[PDB]
Structures are given as C-alpha cells and as structure tokens.
From a paper:
Compared to the RdRPs of other Flaviviridae representatives such as the NS5 of the Japanese encephalitis virus (JEV) and dengue virus (DENV) in the Flavivirus genus and the NS5B of the hepatitis C virus (HCV) of the Hepacivirus genus, the pestivirus NS5B contains a unique ∼90-residue N-terminal domain (NTD) that does not have notable sequence homology to any other viral or host proteins. The global conformation of our CSFV NS5B structures is consistent with the recently reported CSFV structure with an RMSD value of 0.9 Å (95% coverage) between the reported structure and our representative C-682 structure. These structures together reveal that the NTD adopts a globular α/β fold with an α-β-α-β-β-α pattern. The NTD interacts with the palm of the RdRP core intra-molecularly with a mixture of hydrophobic and hydrogen bonding interactions. Collectively, these biochemical data indicated that the RNA synthesis fidelity of CSFV NS5B is fine-tuned by its NTD through the intra-molecular interactions with the RdRP palm.
To better understand the nature of the NTD–RdRP intra-molecular interface interactions and whether they regulate the RdRP fidelity, we designed point mutations at the Y471 and E472 sites in the context of the WT NS5B and the N- and C-terminal deletion mutants. The other two structures, obtained using the C-672 construct bearing the Y471A-E472A double mutation (C-672_AA) and the C-672 construct with the E472A single mutation (C-672_E472A), were solved in a space group different from those of the WT, C-682 and C-672 structures. Very interestingly, the C-672_AA and C-672_E472A adopt a drastically different global conformation with the NTD–RdRP interface no longer maintained (C-672_AA structure shown in Figure 3D). The NTD–RdRP intra-molecular interactions are fully disrupted, and the NTD is rather involved in a non-intensive three-way interaction involving two symmetry-related neighboring NS5B molecules in the crystal lattice. As suggested by the two open conformation crystal structures (C-672_AA and C-672_E472A), the NTD–RdRP disengagement might occur in solution. In the chromatography analysis, the crystallographic open conformation C-672_AA and the C-672, or the AA mutant and the WT, had consistent retention volumes. By carefully comparing the proteolytic profiles at representative time points for all three constructs, the AA mutant also produced a few proteolytic products that either had obviously different amount from the WT or were consistent with the characteristic products of the N-91. These observations suggest that though the closed conformation is dominant for the AA mutant in solution, the open conformation AA mutant likely exists in solution as a minor fraction.
Residue numbers in the entry: 13 to 88, 90 to 123, 131 to 531, 538 to 671
Amino acid sequence: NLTPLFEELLQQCPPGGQNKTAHMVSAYQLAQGNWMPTSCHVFMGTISARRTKTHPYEAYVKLRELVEEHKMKTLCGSSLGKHNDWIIGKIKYQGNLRTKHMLNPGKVAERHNVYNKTIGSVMTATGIRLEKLPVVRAQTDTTNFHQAIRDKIDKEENLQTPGLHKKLMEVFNALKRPELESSYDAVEWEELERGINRKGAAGFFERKNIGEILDSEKNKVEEIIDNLKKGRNIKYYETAIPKNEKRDVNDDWTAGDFVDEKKPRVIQYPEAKTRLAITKVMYKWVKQKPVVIPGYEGKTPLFQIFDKVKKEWDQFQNPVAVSFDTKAWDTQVTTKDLELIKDIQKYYFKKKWHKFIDTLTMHMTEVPVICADGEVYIRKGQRGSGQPDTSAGNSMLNVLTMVYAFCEATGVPYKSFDRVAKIHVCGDDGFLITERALGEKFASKGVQILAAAGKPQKITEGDKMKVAYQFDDIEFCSHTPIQVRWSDNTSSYMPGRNTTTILAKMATRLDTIAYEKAVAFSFLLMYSWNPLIRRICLLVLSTELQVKPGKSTTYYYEGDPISAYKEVIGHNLFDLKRTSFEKLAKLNLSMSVLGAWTRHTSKRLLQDCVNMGVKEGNWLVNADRLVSSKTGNRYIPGEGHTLQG
C-alpha cells in the first residue's frame, strides 16, 4: 500500500476550510484508488477528488505537483511591487490601457457648471456678452482620459544626474532649522478636524467620505496610523479621475480658484481614511504649520502675495525675476526625490515617527493606481496630485532643485544663496529674484541644468528661461502684479489677471444670492484694481442687504463688506484713486479681442452705480471713488471683518 507515504505528504499540504461543496477524500482513502485530487488544501485530512480511476500512485504524483505549485506561487514570484502584491486579488478582467512604460494588470468591477443668477444678470445688463467669454470648467471624455494617462503619466523616472540628491541635501543642509529638529509630532483630532472639508473625496474601494470617516470609524484611521508607525506595509492604493470629475475635492481651503486650476488633467488620490491617517500625523509638515520651506507662499493669501514681494524686489541694485515652467511637474518626481523629502520630514519629525515616514515613502514610490473605470496601473514613482504631501513636499523639492540650478549655473555657494537671490514658490510654481547679472546666467544655462536634474523646463524660446525685467511682468499663482495709487499718494501692488478670465471665473458655478454675494466679496478683495469688476461687486453686494453672505467660497464677510475689505487690504475701497494705466490695458485687451464688452459697457456700468447711490442715504455702491464723486454721497460702513472656508 501507499498510505504510510500519503500520511507523509498530508502533514505538509497546506490548510483549508473543510468544504462540502465537493468530495473531501480520506488521508488513507487516497491510497485506495480512483481518488485523485482536483485541489489540495487539507481539512485536517481531506482534499478534493475526481473519481477518475487514478492509481494509488497517480494520486501522490498529482498532489505533490500541487504542493510544488503552492510552494511556488507562495513563498519561494515577482512583479506588482514587493508590497503591492495584494492588488492582484481585486482583479477580474484583463486590462486595455495600452501602457508602454509601466504595468497594467487588468481592471476591477466598476457635474455640470451653471450660471450665477444675480452676477450673470448684472453683467449682461451692462453689455458683457457671456457667450463671448472663456469656458473655465470643461470636463473630459474617458477615451481622451485614457490617452491622458499614456501621454503624461506612464513613463520611466527621469534621469537625475549622479550624486545630485547629495548636493540637494547639501543645499537643504543650509536652509535647515535646527531649532525645530526632531520636534514635530502628531496633532490631536480637534486641530486636524478644524479645517477639513467634510466632503473630501473617497478612494475607489471606499463608501464613506472624509466627514463620515470622522463621524464613525475614527478608530479605523487610528489603525492605519498605528501600523505605519510600527513598520507594517498598509494596503496603499491611489485612485485616478479626470480633472473636474465629481470626486476632485480639496481637503483644505484653496486661497484662490487658481489652485484647482493649476491641477493636472489626471488627479491621483489615496483613500480618504488614508488622507486622514497621514494628516493627523504629518500635519505640521503637510499643512506646513510652521513654515519651513523658504519662499513657500501656499499659506499666504492672494492680496499680499505681491505686496510682500515688491518689498524684496526693491532692494536689488538692479533686479530681475525668473520663472519655473517645469513641464508637468508631478510626473517629473524620481524615487530618489521622494526619498529626499523623506529624509527632510525625518529631520523635523520626532524619533518615534520616522518609521511612519520610512514606511509611507516606500509605498509612495511604487504606487498602484485604480482608474475611474477599474483599470489598475502601477505608477513609476512620481507624485499623486491629491496626496497630502503634494504642496508641502513638491515645494521643498522645487526650491532645493532650483537653488541647485541657480548655484550650479552661477557658482554662488549654496550657503551664500540668500545673499544674492530670493525665491518664491507654491508647490511647483514659482520664481526667483536677483540681480540682472546673475539672473541672465541662470536664465540661459537653466533649461539645461534642469533637464539634467529631471525637472525639464517647457519648450520656451531659444532655451532661455522666462525672465521678468520689470516688476509687473512677473507671473505667479496665475496672477500678475498691477499697481494702484491711494488717496494718500502711496503705491501698492494688487493681484492682476485678465478681465475676461475674471468674468469667466466669476459668473459660473458647478451644480443662492447669499453665495452670489460671498463670491462678489471674495472677488473684490483681489480685483478692486479693476473698476469694471469693482463696480460689479458693489452692485451685487448692494442687492438684498437683508441676506447674510454665504460661506462656501474662498472668503466671506462678517458685517459691513467695505469695513472688512479695509481690515485685510489696509485701505478703504474709496481710497482707490488710480489703477496702473498700462497694466490695465493689457488685462482688459482680451475683452476687445473676444468681443465680450461694448463701447458703451464701461459707462453703462458706472451709470447703474450712480443711478443707485444717488438717493439720499448710505449706499454701498458709493464705496467706489468715482461713483461717490459724481453721486455726492459717501458710504459710512459699520464694523466688518473677513473670514474663510
């Protein structure tokens, strides 16, 4: 017989759930005969069968090949990353993504923009053709979306020069802050929850959102935080959706409608529980609570971005400004990069939390991404746009690279950098200010030094970087400095943009007079230099003064808007005596070329304001310097303040 040898193997064939769905044969009944396996896992002494007339040896022949098969797949395989192997389970279909430079194992089982009633109506009444105004919320087809991944996302990590990331540390070793070293730690549930979008998007396998995760399974996030701190691999996946998909939702407050506009076609975001797990821990770094990365303006509000800068620009014997057009930055992040920012995080975080960093970064190098339609792909490094670390990390990266490029092109020591240039960034977008001498070197030798670093500039001109020679040619956060002159003869620069582009952003929604006002106040803080837009905002704010403003847009106001504006701008809207002559030409010209306004549109808006603030009394529209001037009245405003979120 053969049983005494069948008992040998069975104490080695793997365990299983005793399943009655078929024929579980006996530890000896195998040597009987005609009882050959069709499956292996043992139920404390059974396997499958087939009644296939097998010989008491043909059984052992077959089974032992399954044990060889099992001891093979398991234990003694490859692919899909060394930590990401879990994702093979959730596959069901073979995958059509046609990706040439990264994996693609299969697929899984799988917001219109409307007009602002009041604000739109205001515009038309003056001659503004909304038909002739840019569309600023277009979506994208999935056919087009699929090609967006191949065109932009599937690529091998750029070639970053030998011993570069040592020089980048060499750089960060100048701008480090020993006063905070090994100090950061997790934040409590209140400080995290204070500013948090209760409707923050959920991962592909999730069903609740940021709020509900907070409401109910707060302990589930405490798990993700524990294991990561202890050193364990966590099921890290990212989800990928197109831009302006219903699930493109910011967990933090945007200081402008430009942030969601400097977004990439392809948004990659981790499970919402995982967004919290990272953030209750890395809050001090990711939000950048103390600000550590020099020149990071992501916490600065838009109205002072340029006021603050012109205080620097006005110090250089002869200053120039140079821009950073990194071609689709996010897909230009190598794995040594993410390992650099990793070391940084560990410079400021405590000792207990390094493992967290150590672990989380490992996952962030080999990232499985599930698409909207189920098509999972593996990302070759790079930054997912919706990761908590995006603004925080990306920015550190930008200055370190760009410092490196600036010193590498000019020979200025990394230590002596602040003595010869100033740097402002905002994630990947930024610029740098220095003398005409130095700027020109960095301007030409820059496209090269930078492509050499894996951060390739755009197509540009003759391979020179973008150089701003006069201050009001700078671009930043998608706005440009325009200058205003006040009652008291002072100058001060405001955040300029194109009139058409503002009217487009302002009239449109995304699937409510109180909201329409909060928009017109939020637009006034930035665009009061633009009289067409100033007069519009006053005309809207002055409607339905009963109705308190809404709170879902960038800013809003508590009390008398013209007093709130005063609190944040440091000047009364009435004090706006003149807007820069030439710079207002440029930003208004788009309007004549698209034909969005008429000869009569300028005067007609003003007349509506004078027609309104002429009746005896204290009328909002009279906040405009000229309106009040020809309407004889003035606006006497009560206590008012500015808020956000």
